[PDB]
Design a binder for this molecule. Structure first.
Ligand SMILES: *O=P([O])([O])OP([O])(=O)O[C][C]1O[C](N2[C]=[N+]([C])C3=C2N=C([N])[N]C3=O)[C]([O])[C]1[O]
Ligand SMILES: [Mg+2]
Ligand SMILES: [Mg+2]
Ligand SMILES: [Zn+2]
Ligand SMILES: [Zn+2]
Ligand SMILES: [Zn+2]
Lengths: 648, 650, 641
RNA sequence: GAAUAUAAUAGUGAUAUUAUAUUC
RNA sequence: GAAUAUAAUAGUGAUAUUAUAUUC
C-alpha cells in the first residue's frame, strides 16, 4: 500500500458509511486511491455467509484498461477476483457468469445497458456497489443515465430488490443553463436525483493539504485583432459564380465566409437531389453537377475559415489537397472545369501565401507568447487546443515552418515532444505528460471542461492562455468562471441541508422524471408497406428497393439479391474497426461512371459477407407517386422493416 | 506492438509451427515478447468455428501479476479474455467456468495440480497451448513435473484426448550431476522428455544482434583469509565449554566449535534430550526444560561464532545480546537466569574486543576495498550483494552504515517473507526485474549453474562486473566447475540440435514410457495405523498436551485438537504475519502455558465457520501409553497413527 | 577495405600526436601501421622529406613487416629497406638510412649504431614506430632508443624530434595493487615513449567485438599424485648427500633444494688445499656429487609434472650421456643400477598415474569428441615437459587421434613460450596451459591464439597459487582498462605536464644512478677450471675483443682444451661459430666456451662463468658469472698475434 | 454501420446543420 | 660468446639462482 492524503479519507468517508454519494474533487488529486479505498472497505465490510460485488464504470477504453490493471493488481492480494468487459471481449461470452464469478467488474456502460436490455442480466440487484467515473455524464440519453433509469425504475416500484450503493466521481457536477444560484441548485438536485445520491462529498477540513497538491493555473485572456484581406478579394468571385453556374441550371430563392453560408450550401445541396425530371438521363447530369458545385463551395468556405484562423498557406494547401483528391477519384468535365478555373487563379495565389506582409496577427501573438514562456523556461511543456482537426497539422506546419520557433517539437493528439497539439479530449481521460503551459486557440467549451482542463497543469507555476480574435469567446469563458462559483456555492449550500429533506426532494424529482419518461412513450410509426426505390444521392442512379433491404439487430441495414451486387464498388477500409458482432472488411461506393459516392461499408457478419448501407447516402423515391424524400437517420425512415433471416 | 528483435523471431519460430519447444536464451533478452508472439500467433491460427486456450505457468506471484498485466493489456484489444488464478483467489470459485470463459489463463502450477487432483478439471485437453516459465524446474516432484506427469499419463495411455502444445522458457536447462558431455546430453534429453519437447530453440543466426543487447558480465575471484588470531572465538569457546559442562552434569554425551558439524551435533543432542523420561514427571519437566535451554544457548553461541567468522564481532555481539534480551523479555527462568549472568560476566571483555580496530575481518576490508575502488571510478554505480543468511544481510547493512570509509553508500534490504547498494539473500530463478546492477558481489555465496547464468541478468550492460569474495577455496572450485558445466550444457544442446527431429522424438518417447512405468512400481505402500492412543508431550517442558484420539486430520494435511481439555493447555499471541492458505486463515500463534516454557506449538486459524488450533508434530514428542516408550517425529505423515478425518460434528 | 575501428585507432596519430595504441592481439595492427605511415609520408611538402623507422624485436616480424611495407609503398614512390643482424655489418648504415624513406630495424641495430656514433641523433627520422611498445622499459633496446630521444629532448639541444607511435595489446600495470598505482605506472610508460595519447576502440567497439572474440577461460585445479617413487629415489640422494658429507664439513624435490645444491656447489669451487692434486680430486668429487644431485632433483620434479617413466628415461639419458663411468661415478651409476629394478616396476605400473595427465587426457577426449577437427595448442614451462608430454601423447592409447608437433600439418602443437604476439599463428580452437602462468600482458596476447568464436582456454594445475596468480592478472587487466579510460578524460596540456615532469624525474634518476668506473687491479691472477681446479691460463694472456668477448693468446692454453663440433652453429656480430671448447683433462670434460672464426684469424672465445679466479699473491679463490663483474687489466685484442 | 455526448450556428421550441470526441 | 626481457624461488631491498624466450 501507500500513505494516503487526509482529504482522500475525507472524500471517501461518506461512501464508506454506506451512503449513495457524489464525490466532487479537483482533477488529478488522486480519485483512483479513493475508489480503491471505498471498494476495499465495501468488500471487507461483509460477513462470511455473504459476499459483495462491485462494478466500475469507465466511459472510455484507456480508463478501462488503467483502472482494470490497478484494481486487479491491488485487490488480488486481498483475495478478490477482478475482471473487465469491453466491446472487444463482450461477444460470444456468458456475461452473467463472468459477473457472478467475480468480485470487481470494470465495464464500459454500453455493455451493461445492452445486457440489461437483452435480458442476460436480470436486475442490478446482483451488484452491491456501482461506481461511475465522470458521473457528470449521468444525464439525457447517455448510457450512465440509461443504467440509472433501470436502477430507479426498480427502486420506484413495488418490486423490491437489494439495490447497490451508488458512488459518483467527478471534478464538476455542472449547473446547466442556470442564470442564478437557485437554478444551479435545482440542476445539482436533478443530477443527484439521476444518481440517487444523498450526499455530495467535497474537501473541507483538509483543503490546506489539497491546495498544496493541486495548483490552479493562472488564466490569462488574450484578445487579438483580426487580419487586415490578401485571401478575401480573390476567392470571392470564385464563390460568386461557382454558385451561379449552379444557378445556370435553375433559379434558387447570407454573407460569405461564415457558418451560415455552410448551412446554406448544405441545405441547398440537400434540396437539389430531389429535382424530379421526366428526362431522368440528364437529371443525373444536373444533380451530379450541382453536387460537385456545392461540394466545391463548402470546401472553399473551409479554406476561408482556415485562413481566418491560421496560415493562408494552409488555406491553400487545403484546396490543393482537395483538388488533388478530386483528380485522383477520376476526371470529370465539370470537375476538370472547376479545377481549371481554380488553377487559373492559383498563380496569383501561392505568391500571396509567400509574403510576410500578410501574416495572421493571431499567430504572431502566439509566437510572442511561446517565445516568451520558452525564454523564461526552456524546459516548458505546452499543450494546445484547437476547434477542428484541420487546424491541427495547420498549426504544426506553421510551427516547423518558422525558424523563430525552432525550439519546438510538435506532437499530435486527435482520434520526446515539447508541444502537443490536440483537438478536444473527452473528460479527464488517461493522464498524459504534465504541462507547464496550456494554450486555447479559439477553443472554449462548457464549465466542466474548464475545470477538468486544470488537471493538465496542476503543478505550481502552470499557466493557461486563452487566445482568440472574438469577444464572444471571452465572455463565454467568463460566464463559465461564474458558473463554477454558482456550482461550488450551491453545493456548499446543499451540504447544510438535512439528509432526510434532501432525500425526499431527490425522491420527488425522481418520481417526476419517471412519470415524464413513462408518459413519453408514444404511437410512433405506421409502417408504409409501399415499396420505395432507393437511389444514389450524387448521380441519382438506382441503388435498390425497400423490399430488398433487411434490418439487422434493429439497427443496421443490408441489401439482399444479386442485383445490388452490380451497383457498387469496394475498396479496403482505411480504419478496419470491429463493432458489435460485425467486422469492417471494406468500404462501399457507387458504380455509375466514376461517381464513386460513398454508400456504406462491407462487413463480415458471422458467416455472412454482406453490404451495410446508410440511408443518408440515398434518396427515397416512391415507385408509385414519385415524391423523392430524404432521411438523415434510418429510424426516421419508417417502412416495412423485415428482420434479417439467414434462410433468404 | 513494434520492433521485435530478429533473434526473438528466431526463438519463437519453432514454437510457431506447433512443435513442442524448450527455449534457451540468456536472462534479459526479452522472453516476455517471445511469449506474446508465440501466444498471439497460436491464437490467430485457429479458424472461425474453433478457438484456442493458452495457459501460462508462473512460479512466483510477482511474475504472475506482471504476466497477467501484460497479457491483459496486449490481448484485450484483439478480443481475448485474459484472466488469472493464484492461491489468494482459488477458493470457492468455479475453476472449470473461469478456465472455459477465458482465452488466456495465468496460473501458479500448484493450482492446476490441486484442481486436477480434485477432478474439477477433467483433462488438459481443454488447453491448446501450455507455456512454462522457468521450465528447468520440471524435475523430481515440483508442480510442473506433476502437471507433465498428468500430460504424459494421458498421452502414453489409451486416452486419445487432444493434448496441447508445450513450450518451456529458460536460460539454462541444467546438467544435474553430470561429469562429462554425454551425461549432460542425457540429462537434457531427460528434461525434454519430461516436457514432451522435440525442439531446443537457441540463437544461432542472430548472435551478433543478441550479443549487443545482452552482455556477459566479467567475473572475478577474490580469495582471502579469515582472522589471523581471534580473541572473540576464545571467549565464546570457553562460554561454550562452560554451558556444555553445565549440560554434561545431567547426562554423559556418548568435533569443533563454530562449525556446522557442531550445529548438527547440538541439534541431535537437543533431539535426544527430549526422549529422556522420568517416573517423577516433575524432575522430567525440570531437567528436560533445562537441557533444552542449554542446547539452545549453545546453538546461539554457534550462530554467533559463524556470524563473527563472516562479519564483525559487533554483529555476533548484538546477535547474542538480542537473543538474551529476547529470552529475558520472555520471563526469566531458573535454569536460564544463571546463563544471562554468565554471559554478562564476560560481556565487558567481548565488548572491549569488539571495538578494537586491529582484529577486524579482512574479508570486509577486501570488500570495502572493492567497493571503494569501484565507486571511485564510477560514483553512480548500482551494486547488488548476495549473502547466505539474513543475519549476514543485517550484519552487512549495519557494517556499511557503520563505516566512515563507505559513507557514500545507501544500503537496502531484499530478503524473503534511492539506494546505491542492495543487500539480498537469494532470488529464486530470474524473478522480477529490478534495476540494472553494473556490480554484482557474491559474499561467500554459490549455487547451481542455472543460478550462475541467471545472475548475469542483473548486470546485462556493457562493463558490468561480478566479484566472488571468499575465504574458502571450495567456493571458487564450485564456481569454475559450474562454468565447465555450462560449457557441457551448451555443447550438449548444440549437438542435440544437429539431430533428426524424428529420432529425437523417438528417444523422448522411449524415455517417457520408461519413466512412466518406473513411476508405476513401488510407490504403493500402506503402513498400518496403530489404533493405540498415544499421549503428546511438549518437547520443551514435557507437559501433557493431548491424546492422539483427540487429534483430527483436516484435508489430509493439517491437524487439530478437540475437547475443552486441550484449551487449557495453551495460550496465544496475535500472529506477526497472518495469511490465508487454502481454506484457512491465520489469526494467532499458539504457545504452551506451563510457567517459564512458552514453547512454539502451532497456530490458531479460522477454518470455514470453525475457530480451531492447528498443531505440528514437529513441536511435540509422542508417548506410547502401552509400551511407555517416547518417540520423536518431525513430519505428520511420518507419524502413522490412526487418522481420524475431520467432521463438522463433535 | 579498412575497418572503422582501425581508422579510429589511427586518427590520433594522423594528427601528429605521439600515441600508444591498445587493441586486442590480431585485429589488424599492420593495416593501421600502413595507414599512419602513408599519411605521415604524404604530409610533407616538396622541399622537405619524410623518413619512418619501424622497429621489431623478432626477425620473423621484421621480415613480414618489411615485405608488406615494401610491397605497399613501392608503388607510391618510396624506398623501403630493412636491416637485421645477418646484414648489419660490413655496410655503411649511416648512408643506408639516408637513401631510404622507410627503414625496418631490429632495435639493437639502432642502439649499437647510436653508441658507435655512426648515427648522430634520432633527428634523422621523423616517425618512429615501436612494435610491442610495452617492452619500452628497463634495459630493453627500445628504452635505450627512447633514452637517446629523451636525452636530446630534455637536454639543451633544440633539434627536431620524430613522432613516436607505439603498438600493443596491453600496456601492463607492473605490480600495481590499486587504480592509482596502475594509473601512474601507465603514465611513466607514456613518459618512456613520450606519448600524450592512448588510442583505444570506443566508438566502434561493436565492430571490434564482431571481429575479435574473447575466448572463454576455464581453470582446472587437480591434486598432486597419491608416492613410493618419491622415497625410493630420495634415499638415493640422501645416500649421495651422505657420501658428499663424508668428505666435507629440508624438503627434497623443490627449487629451494635446487639453488641450495647450486650455492653449495659454488661453495665447493672455492674450497682450497695446499696439495693442488688432492684438491682437484676432492673438489671434482664434490662437483660430481652436486651435479648428480641436481639431476636427481629435476627428475623428482618431472616426476610430478608428468609420468614416472619420463623422469626415469631422463635419468637414463643423463647417466648414459655423462659416461662418454669414472671411478667416482662408478659408485653413483652402480647405486643407480641398484635403483632401476625397483623404480621401473613402478614406472610401468598403471596404478600410479599423474592426476594432471588424467584430467588433461579427459579434456582432450571431450573437446575432440565434440569437434573432431579441433586445433589444440599446449603451453608448458620447460622443454623437458615438452618432450615428456609428446611422449605421453603418442604413448597413451586413448589419445590415438592426436598428431603432436613442436614449437620451441599437425593436430596439436606443444610449445614452451612465445615472446609477445609473434607472426602468423595457427588459429586454434583450444588453448591449454599446463602449470603455466605468466603475466597479464602475455595473457591478453595469448587471447590471440583463438580470436575466432567458440575458442576455449584451460589452466591445468595443482598449485592454487597459480590460479590466484592468474586471477590477479585478470584484476590487473581491469585496472589497466579503467586507468586508461580515466586517462582518456584528461586534457592534453595537463597530461603533457605530468609526462614531462615524469621524464625529467626518470632522467635525473638515471644520471644519478651512473656510478664511476672501478679501479682495474692490474696485478695478475690465475684463471683455472671449476670442475677439476686445473690451471687454464693467466689474465695477461687473456685479451678482449669488441669490449664484449674474451680470447687467449697463447699456445700453452691451446693445449689445455679440446674442441668438439657445435650442436647448433650460428653467426653473431663479426664472429662465426664452428666448434666448442672443453677441458682437456681425461675425466673432466667441462664447458669452457667456443672456438670461432672471427674475421681473419680463428680464435677461442671463453666465458668467465666456467672459470674460477685465484690470486698469484694471496691465493684467494673467487667466482664470477659475468665479465662485467670481473674487473681487471682489459687489454684490447688486435690482429698482430 | 449505429448509438451517445459536447460546442457553435438558424429558430419561439420540439428540432435541424456542422464541428469535435467517445462507445457498441 | 655477449646482451636483453618474462616467470618462479630466496631477500626488507639493492640483488642473486634457475627456467623460458629473444636479439647482435
Ligand atoms: O465510414 P464508416 O461507415 O466506415 O464509419 P466511420 O466510423 O468511419 O464514420 C465516420 C464518418 O465520416 C465520414 N468518413 C468515413 N471515412 C473512412 C472518411 C470519411 N470522411 C473523409 N473526408 N475521408 C474518409 O476517409 C463518413 O461519412 C462517416 O459517417
Ligand atoms: Mg449494434
Ligand atoms: Mg657483440
Ligand atoms: Zn452514384
Ligand atoms: Zn511447554
Ligand atoms: Zn677442468
Amino acid at each position: 500500500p501507500f500513505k494516503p492524503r487526509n482529504y482522500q479519507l475525507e472524500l471517501a468517508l461518506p461512501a464508506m458509511k454506506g451512503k449513495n454519494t457524489i464525490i466532487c474533487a479537483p482533477t488529478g488529486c488522486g480519485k483512483t486511491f479513493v475508489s480503491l479505498l471505498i471498494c476495499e472497505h465495501h468488500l471487507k465490510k461483509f460477513p462470511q455467509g455473504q459476499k459483495g460485488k462491485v462494478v466500475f464504470f469507465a466511459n472510455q477504453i484507456p480508463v478501462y484498461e488503467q483502472q482494470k490493471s490497478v484494481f486487479s493488481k491491488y485487490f488480488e492480494r486481498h483475495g478478490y477476483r477482478v475482471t473487465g468487459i469491453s466491446g472487444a471481449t463482450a461477444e460470444n461470452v456468458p456475461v452473467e457468469q463472468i459477473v457472478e464469478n467475480n468480485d470487481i467488474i470494470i465495464l464500459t456502460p454500453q455493455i451493461l445497458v445492452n445486457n440489461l436490455k437483452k435480458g442476460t442480466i436480470p436486475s442490478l440487484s446482483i451488484f452491491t456497489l456501482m461506481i461511475f467515473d465522470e458521473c457528470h455524464n449521468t444525464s439525457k440519453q447517455h448510457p450512465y443515465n440509461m443504467i440509472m433509469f433501470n436502477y430507479l425504475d426498480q427502486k420506484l416500484g413495488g418490486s423490491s430488490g437489494p439495490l447497490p450503493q451508488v458512488i459518483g466521481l467527478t471534478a464538476s457536477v455542472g449547473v446547466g443553463d442556470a442564470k442564478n444560484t437557485d437554478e444551479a441548485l435545482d440542476y445539482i438536485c436533478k443530477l443527484c436525483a439521476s444518481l440517487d445520491a444523498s450526499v455530495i462529498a467535497t474537501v473541507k477540513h483538509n483543503l490546506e493539504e489539497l491546495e498544496q497538491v493541486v495548483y490552479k493555473p493562472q488564466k490569462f485572456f488574450r484578445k487579438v485583432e483580426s487580419r487586415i484581406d490578401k485571401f478575401k478579394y480573390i476567392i470571392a468571385q470564385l464563390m460568386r459564380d461557382t454558385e451561379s453556374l449552379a444557378k445556370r441550371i435553375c433559379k434558387d430563392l447570407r454573407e460569405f465566409g461564415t457558418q451560415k453560408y455552410e448551412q446554406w450550401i448544405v441545405t441547398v445541396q440537400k434540396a437539389c437531389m430531389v429535382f424530379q425530371m421526366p428526362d431522368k438521363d440528364e437529371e443525373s447530369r444536373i444533380c451530379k453537377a450541382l453536387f460537385l458545385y456545392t461540394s466545391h463551395l463548402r470546401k472553399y468556405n473551409d479554406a476561408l475559415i482556415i485562413s481566418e484562423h491560421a496560415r493562408m498557406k494552409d488555406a491553400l494547401d487545403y484546396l490543393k489537397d482537395f483538388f488533388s483528391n478530386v483528380r485522383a477519384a477520376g476526371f470529370d468535365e465539370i470537375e476538370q472545369d472547376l479545377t481549371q478555373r481554380f488553377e487559373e487563379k492559383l498563380q496569383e495565389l501561392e505568391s500571396v501565401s509567400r509574403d510576410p506582409s500578410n501574416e495572421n496577427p493571431k499567430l504572431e501573438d502566439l509566437c510572442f507568447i511561446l517565445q516568451e514562456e520558452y525564454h523564461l523556461n526552456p524546459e516548458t511543456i505546452t499543450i494546445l487546443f484547437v476547434k477542428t482537426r484541420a487546424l491541427v497539422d495547420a498549426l504544426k506546419n506553421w510551427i516547423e515552418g518558422n525558424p523563430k520557433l525552432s525550439f519546438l517539437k510538435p506532437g499530435i493528439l486527435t482520434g520526446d515532444h515539447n508541444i502537443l497539439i490536440a483537438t478536444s479530449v473527452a473528460d479527464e481521460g488517461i493522464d498524459i505528460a504534465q504541462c507547464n503551459l496550456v494554450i486555447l486557440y479559439e477553443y472554449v467549451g462548457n464549465v466542466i471542461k474548464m475545470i477538468q482542463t486544470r488537471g493538465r497543469g496542476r503543478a505550481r507555476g502552470s499557466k493557461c492562455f486563452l487566445l482568440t480574435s472574438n469577444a464572444g469567446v471571452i465572455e463565454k469563458e467568463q460566464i463559465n468562471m461564474y458558473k463554477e462559483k454558482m456550482m461550488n456555492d450551491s453545493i456548499l449550500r446543499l451540504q447544510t441541508w438535512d439528509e432526510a429533506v434532501f432525500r425526499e426532494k431527490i425522491l420527488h424529482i425522481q418520481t417526476h422524471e419517471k412519470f415524464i419518461r413513462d408518459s413519453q412513450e408514444k404511437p410512433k410509426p405506421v409502417p408504409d408497406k409501399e415499396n420505395k426505390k432507393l437511389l444514389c444521392r450524387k448521380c441519382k442512379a438506382l441503388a435498390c428497393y425497400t423490399a430488398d433491404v433487411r434490418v439487422i439487430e434493429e439497427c443496421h441495414y443490408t441489401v439482399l439479391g444479386d442485383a445490388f451486387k452490380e451497383c457498387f464498388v469496394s475498396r479496403p477500409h482505411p480504419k478496419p474497426k470491429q463493432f458489435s458482432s460485425f467486422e469492417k472488411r471494406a468500404k462501399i461506393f457507387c458504380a455509375r461512371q466514376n461517381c464513386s459516392h460513398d454508400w456504406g461499408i462491407h462487413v463480415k457478419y458471422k458467416t455472412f459477407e454482406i453490404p451495410v448501407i446508410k440511408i443518408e447516402s440515398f434518396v427515397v423515391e416512391d415507385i408509385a407517386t414519385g415524391v423523392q424524400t430524404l432521411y438523415s437517420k434510418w429510424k426516421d425512415f419508417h417502412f416495412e422493416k423485415i428482420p434479417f433471416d439467414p434462410a433468404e
